[PDB]
Design a protein around this ligand. Structure first.
Ligand SMILES: *[C@@H]1O[C@H](CO)[C@@H](O[C@@H]2O[C@H](CO)[C@@H](O)[C@H](O)[C@H]2NC(C)=O)[C@H](O)[C@H]1NC(C)=O
Ligand SMILES: *[C@@H]1O[C@H](CO)[C@@H](O[C@@H]2O[C@H](CO)[C@@H](O)[C@H](O)[C@H]2NC(C)=O)[C@H](O)[C@H]1NC(C)=O
Ligand SMILES: *[C@@H]1O[C@H](CO)[C@@H](O[C@@H]2O[C@H](CO)[C@@H](O)[C@H](O)[C@H]2NC(C)=O)[C@H](O)[C@H]1NC(C)=O
Ligand SMILES: *[C@@H]1O[C@H](CO)[C@@H](O[C@@H]2O[C@H](CO)[C@@H](O)[C@H](O)[C@H]2NC(C)=O)[C@H](O)[C@H]1NC(C)=O
Ligand SMILES: *[C@@H]1O[C@H](CO)[C@@H](O[C@@H]2O[C@H](CO)[C@@H](O)[C@H](O)[C@H]2NC(C)=O)[C@H](O)[C@H]1NC(C)=O
Ligand SMILES: *[C@@H]1O[C@H](CO)[C@@H](O[C@@H]2O[C@H](CO)[C@@H](O)[C@H](O)[C@H]2NC(C)=O)[C@H](O)[C@H]1NC(C)=O
Ligand SMILES: *[C@@H]1O[C@H](CO)[C@@H](O[C@@H]2O[C@H](CO)[C@@H](O)[C@H](O)[C@H]2NC(C)=O)[C@H](O)[C@H]1NC(C)=O
Ligand SMILES: *[C@@H]1O[C@H](CO)[C@@H](O[C@@H]2O[C@H](CO)[C@@H](O)[C@H](O)[C@H]2NC(C)=O)[C@H](O)[C@H]1NC(C)=O
Ligand SMILES: *[C@@H]1O[C@H](CO)[C@@H](O)[C@H](O)[C@H]1NC(C)=O
Ligand SMILES: *[C@@H]1O[C@H](CO)[C@@H](O)[C@H](O)[C@H]1NC(C)=O
Ligand SMILES: *[C@@H]1O[C@H](CO)[C@@H](O)[C@H](O)[C@H]1NC(C)=O
Ligand SMILES: *[C@@H]1O[C@H](CO)[C@@H](O)[C@H](O)[C@H]1NC(C)=O
Ligand SMILES: *[C@@H]1O[C@H](CO)[C@@H](O)[C@H](O)[C@H]1NC(C)=O
Lengths: 465, 216, 270, 50, 35, 49, 50
């Protein structure tokens, strides 16, 4: 990895930074309010009596938490098909409000409940709108309607030429006598009651047995959501790197107990910069903590490819007990600057060549990591009547290297970003005077370098030999 | 009559706990050192415009101020909010009601056409209320603990904590207080910027205006 | 800029290899500051120790010499200085190479050398010399004859002791005399804090949290949203890096000046 | 659509060029300071005694 | 190239060598009086 | 960047607080320059004639 | 064969294995290419500018 990040086949002595490591999460936890406001759907589908097809009852449902999965798997229904909405996902949908319409029909009238259809009851009693309807649920009711039901208690409307608008009722009981020219040229006659009675018998077939039919209509994006499906939950864990989804607030970290105190109306605390630091689970109402999972960069210390072929790897700022040949390797040495593995620890101290930090560094004698030494040690015998006077002298020569200039370079402005194109040059005109501004600085730098060299070297007016 | 509101009208803006942090927010607050229309309805409750949330206060420690009827026309044509007291529970009814000349309440009812929603919940005393309507949500903040810094005037620093929230989503442009048959302040609020100081326990202990004084 | 997200990294890996230089600039400045402190403080080849018995012709250096009863083995003035001034989303602060104890030992060695030996320990081996005969040389250097010192020793000792007491009391009582270090610390802390705070900005996208917009739409426009967030955060990081580079250069200049002053004034006479 | 593509390329290359120019300016300033120090040292320690 | 170029220095290396030789001869022969 | 337009301020307040450190840097360099000239020229305590 | 460019062509001295089609040195700079008709390798370099 060091050779990869260096892009060379030779590595000199020193310490390099290759990559970084993080602790992966293990499982997930999701929580939601302990209570669940149940919606009384029992009184709708299991009502004692239903109205007629021409006078269906409409009932209003809102501020409910209704589950459709508990009803989807029920086999007590003859047919449950929904238009444009997947029932299985209805548990994860929020709608503004819901309208319910329960009634009873004959056996063969089930197919009449569909948008864009033609029929006596489809156009004369209840018309589905030319859009998406929630859906229709139908089931057999011969036990309570075809055996003990009223013989004429169920009525339909044989009133034609009166196609009703969707979601409209005409319960006006008016005798259908035109009383004008377009009825046999007589007034009063041809009078037929708008209503007529179903003809049913106990187990008379399949198309005549009354069936319970309920239409549920949803509204979406008309108002703030009032009805939503229930959401599941799970238990909690401690001292583990977990991703959490506490009632909308999502994140990752490790959970610990806390001693902070919340007022009875807050939900989650913080310290600064929108960093959540304490959340309370709705079920237990206990205060908790959030701590980011440990991570950090790694480093490789090597004495050089030439001398040896052994390295030591160090994790920076990690109290490495969750360390997963060098997965554990040699003795682990935890220091003030993380932890090092691959080098034994000695008890003496010498001069330092490859610094690590916190006063410690490693060198190749195997690789040994020790504490930096400040140098030699001596004590001068100070007195109040003693001096030391030198008696001999030496002359020494040293060296001192100082840079004075760097290579002068220039970069073409339009050539770099255009590559000899007319369209690029034409569209570069709309960005203002960036080009000249970028081009001037390099020339200024080159002039400065020339002046710098000339000033630093030219200090004599003549030439001596 | 006019009264000078010294420093009242600061409430918790959100549901976030904080400690030992100076937080600057931009929200609808009551401006410091403002004027409030002192009323003396004692032997007189005219209709006052809503205008984007209203402050409310009282100083009588008994059940005489009962309800606050809301709406845009105060007739059965449009739905009208009603929040009334019972000395044992508080009931809220948004269902449409007809006009009333001199309503009487204490421990009026005209019609209930197209009923839609219902809600049931649980020196003298000061009752401070703040009514707000934002993105179709109705919010009521309340404080019931009085402090006698000065007498006959509401001086002192006190915070307001939320109680309920209603997802009604209706237009409110008119409201009226309800009385019985036999001294409350009203103020308007503006979108100001405030600085708030939190204690170590998360309680607001000091507030500073940001558009009042050069020192501010 | 990603926070362990797959599609975020997939979109990020097409903006070139900028992270290499972004990390290398910070590593370079870190090495630069390490070299700065090393060159400022490492100026002696040995570690001298003060004699157990101290009789410096009447002078009193007790308040400046290290106290062998303190937890960190530091003198009084150093403790007052330490007690006077006082001041994590993918960014770390590395510990320094040289700890406090090593710096304290270096300063103690320098002080012992300049007390017992004088200027001779900065140009070879340390040489013992009585303190009075060093004060005589230091007065003779500035034109005043050495006859003045040997007949006015008590006055000089008393004046020096009174001055050191007054300066100790001034440091103990008077505050706001350490503006530079506090300003540097405050600037660094504020820069880091605002860099952290820059995360919450919307940058014109739907939301400031990646997963929410990721889990509420489809990739055709999620790509645009992620691109906007990424470019904004990249610009912020570039600005922070530039400011850090400028501050590092200024600190290097100041450290060089301090090193020159310490090398000239302490080890000899100006 | 070629305008959109070339706009993307142009803005990316402009940011890269800006970063390069700023880095060169910083390095040039540091080199100038070092060369001034060297000039002072050579002017003082050669033509005289320190 | 591909848009980038390197300019040559104004002072050649021989001129720098001559400056160094002149300075060194002057400081050997005259000491510091020639400054 | 706009010259008295509201739609700008609405859009620009969403970009963060760049102007804060921009103005901070400008004021810092101004104060530094003033202190610089003051230190260069003010080197005496009295005035002589 | 769809690869457009501008520059001067020369006979090449490098050796291609029998299965390449062209070659480059740094960052997509096509230095050599074999023609699709004569199967002869040529080298491409841009002409003078400055
Ligand atoms: C949360 O729901 C569970 C389901 O019954 C209940 O938890 C109990 O809460 C009471 C306190 O109200 C504890 O004394 C019990 O130990 C809890 N567990 C059980 C198994 O009873 C309770 O209904 C709800 N808890 C709350 C709201 O705190
Ligand atoms: C209507 O009544 C039937 C009566 O059987 C309900 O069926 C219930 O089904 C569950 C699941 O098997 C059983 O545990 C119950 O014992 C059954 N009876 C009752 C009274 O709950 C059915 O759930 C009811 N549905 C509605 C919408 O009311
Ligand atoms: C790294 O974490 C471990 C805990 O996993 C720390 O171990 C502690 O060791 C001391 C002394 O042996 C015990 O008194 C503590 O009880 C241990 N901690 C726990 C949580 O049990 C260890 O000290 C940590 N290392 C560093 C450098 O902080
Ligand atoms: C000072 O030291 C020098 C060496 O650094 C001494 O010169 C040496 O003297 C010995 C004895 O005569 C010779 O064997 C060496 O060859 C000499 N060295 C050189 C380099 O010439 C010199 O004698 C010493 N001076 C005193 C006074 O002791
Ligand atoms: C407050 O009244 C306004 C009209 O003055 C409502 O605005 C209209 O609302 C209807 C909803 O039935 C929409 O179909 C119209 O498109 C809206 N028109 C305009 C111009 O906004 C507004 O919805 C009402 N607010 C509430 C909460 O009911
Ligand atoms: C925050 O809450 C703590 C805990 O109650 C308060 O500390 C108490 O303070 C009172 C006097 O102020 C003492 O008599 C108690 O002994 C303290 N108890 C503890 C556990 O410390 C603290 O005062 C509160 N801070 C506020 C309200 O600002
Ligand atoms: C050097 O000065 C220090 C100043 O603190 C002296 O320490 C105190 O000196 C006074 C009087 O000299 C004593 O009453 C105190 O008890 C000393 N305090 C301590 C902590 O020692 C110190 O004595 C002086 N040294 C000399 C040799 O005069
Ligand atoms: C020079 O100045 C010093 C200090 O200002 C004088 O010493 C003081 O003399 C007075 C009078 O005897 C004493 O009360 C003080 O205690 C002395 N101060 C100190 C620190 O010892 C000294 O007398 C002056 N000399 C001349 C010639 O004027
Ligand atoms: C390795 O070190 C030895 C010893 O100095 C030297 O002779 C040799 O050239 C070095 N090789 C490399 C590749 O550096
Ligand atoms: C060094 O030796 C001492 C003396 O026994 C011992 O207490 C200490 O643990 C040793 N250090 C190490 C790192 O082994
Ligand atoms: C309140 O009204 C009174 C009388 O109208 C006036 O004197 C006073 O200045 C007003 N105060 C404010 C804050 O408007
Ligand atoms: C008031 O309370 C009584 C008894 O608790 C109850 O019968 C009545 O319906 C309540 N009225 C309202 C408006 O809440
Ligand atoms: C009742 O109010 C709702 C509000 O959406 C409206 O749709 C409905 O038609 C109203 N019903 C009557 C009978 O006015």
């Amino acid at each position: 990895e060091t050779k990869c990040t260096l892009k060379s086949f030779t590595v000199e002595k020193g310490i390099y930074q290759t990559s970084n490591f993080r602790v992966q999460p293990t499982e997930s936890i999701v929580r939601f309010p302990n209570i669940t406001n149940l919606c009384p759907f029992g009184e709708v589908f299991n009502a004692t009596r239903f109205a007629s097809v021409y006078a269906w009852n409409r009932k209003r449902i809102s501020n409910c938490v209704a589950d459709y999965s508990v009803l989807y798997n029920s086999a007590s229904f003859s047919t449950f098909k929904c238009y444009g909405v997947s029932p299985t996902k209805l548990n994860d949908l929020c709608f503004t409000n819901v309208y319910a319409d329960s009634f009873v029909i004959r056996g063969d009238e089930v197919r009449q409940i569909a948008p864009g259809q033609t029929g006596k009851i489809a156009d004369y009693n209840y018309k589905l709108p030319d859009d998406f309807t929630g859906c229709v649920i139908a089931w057999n009711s011969n036990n309570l309607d075809s055996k003990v039901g009223g013989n004429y208690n169920y009525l339909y409307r044989l009133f034609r030429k009166s196609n009703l608008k969707p979601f409209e009722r005409d319960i006006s009981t008016e005798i259908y006598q035109a009383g004008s020219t377009p009825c046999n040229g007589v007034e009063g006659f041809n009078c037929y009651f708008p209503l007529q009675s179903y003809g049913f018998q106990p187990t008379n077939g399949v198309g005549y047995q009354p069936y319970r039919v309920v239409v549920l209509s949803f509204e979406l994006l008309h108002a703030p959501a009032t009805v939503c499906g229930p959401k599941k939950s799970t238990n909690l864990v401690k001292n583990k790197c977990v991703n959490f989804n506490f009632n909308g607030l999502t994140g990752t970290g490790v959970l610990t107990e806390s001693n902070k105190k919340f007022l009875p109306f807050q939900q989650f605390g913080r310290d600064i910069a929108d960093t959540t630091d304490a959340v309370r689970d709705p079920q237990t109402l206990e205060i908790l903590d959030i701590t980011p999972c440990s991570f950090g960069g790694v480093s490789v210390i090597t004495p050089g490819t030439n001398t040896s072929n052994q390295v030591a790897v160090l994790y920076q700022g990690v109290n490495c007990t969750e360390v997963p040949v060098y997965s554990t390797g040699s003795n682990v040495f935890q220091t003030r600057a993380g932890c090092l593995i691959g080098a034994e620890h000695v008890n003496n101290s010498y001069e330092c060549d490859i610094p690590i930090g916190a006063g410690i560094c490693a060198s190749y004698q195997s690789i040994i990591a020790y504490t930096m030494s400040l140098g030699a040690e001596n004590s001068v015998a100070y007195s109040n009547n003693s001096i030391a006077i030198p008696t001999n002298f030496t002359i020494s020569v040293t060296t001192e290297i100082l840079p004075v200039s760097m290579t002068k370079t220039s970069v073409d402005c339009t050539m770099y970003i255009c590559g000899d194109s007319t369209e690029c040059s034409n569209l570069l005109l709309q960005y203002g005077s960036f080009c000249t501004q970028l081009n001037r600085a390099l020339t200024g730098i080159a002039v400065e370098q020339d002046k710098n060299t000339q000033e630093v070297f030219a200090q004599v007016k003549q030439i001596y030999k | 009559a006019y009264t000078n509101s010294f420093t009242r009208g600061v409430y918790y803006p959100d549901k976030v706990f904080r400690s030992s942090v100076l937080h600057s927010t931009q929200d609808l607050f009551l401006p410091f050192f403002s004027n409030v229309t002192w009323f003396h309805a004692i032997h007189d409750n005219p209709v006052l415009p809503f205008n984007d949330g209203v402050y409310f206060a009282s100083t009588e420690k008994s059940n005489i101020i009962r309800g606050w009827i809301f709406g845009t026309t105060l007739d059965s044509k449009t739905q009208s909010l009603l929040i009334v007291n019972n000395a044992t529970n508080v009931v809220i009814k948004v269902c449409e009601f007809q006009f009333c000349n001199d309503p009487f309440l204490g421990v009026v009812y005209s019609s209930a056409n197209n009923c839609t929603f219902e809600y049931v919940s649980q020196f003298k005393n000061l009752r401070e209320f703040v009514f707000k309507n934002i993105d179709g949500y109705f919010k009521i903040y309340s404080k019931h603990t009085p402090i006698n810094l000065v007498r006959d005037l509401p001086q002192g620093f006190s915070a307001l904590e939320p109680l309920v929230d209603l997802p009604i989503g209706i237009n409110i442009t008119r409201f009226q207080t309800l009385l019985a048959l036999h001294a409350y302040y009203v103020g308007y609020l503006q979108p100001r910027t405030f600085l708030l100081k939190y204690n170590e326990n998360g309680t607001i202990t000091d507030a500073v205006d940001c558009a009042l004084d050069p020192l501010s | 800029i990603c926070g362990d997200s797959t599609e975020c990294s997939n979109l990020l890996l097409q903006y070139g290899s900028f992270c290499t230089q972004l990390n290398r600039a910070l590593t370079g400045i870190a090495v630069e500051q390490d070299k700065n402190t090393q060159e400022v403080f490492a100026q002696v080849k040995q570690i001298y120790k003060t004699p157990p018995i101290k009789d410096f012709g009447g002078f009193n250096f007790s308040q400046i010499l290290p106290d062998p009863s303190k937890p960190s083995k530091r003198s009084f003035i150093e403790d007052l200085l330490f007690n006077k001034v006082t001041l994590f989303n993918g960014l770390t602060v590395l510990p320094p190479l040289l700890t406090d104890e090593m710096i304290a030992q270096y300063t103690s060695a320098l002080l012992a050398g300049t007390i017992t030996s004088g200027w001779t320990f900065g140009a070879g081996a340390a040489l013992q010399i009585p303190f009075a005969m060093q004060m005589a040389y230091r007065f003779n250097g500035i034109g005043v004859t050495q006859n003045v010192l040997y007949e006015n020793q008590k006055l000089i000792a008393n004046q020096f002791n009174s001055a050191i007491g007054k300066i100790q009391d001034s440091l103990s009582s008077t505050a706001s005399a350490l503006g530079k270090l506090q300003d540097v610390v405050n600037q660094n802390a504020q820069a880091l804090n605002t860099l952290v705070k820059q995360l919450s900005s919307n940058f014109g996208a739907i939301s400031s949290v990646l997963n929410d917009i990721l889990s509420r739409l489809d990739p055709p426009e999620a790509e645009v949203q992620i691109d906007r967030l990424i470019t904004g955060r990249l610009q912020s990081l570039q600005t922070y890096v530039t400011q850090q580079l400028i501050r590092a250069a200024e600190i290097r200049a100041s450290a060089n000046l301090a090193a020159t002053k310490m090398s000239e004034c302490v080890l000899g006479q100006s």
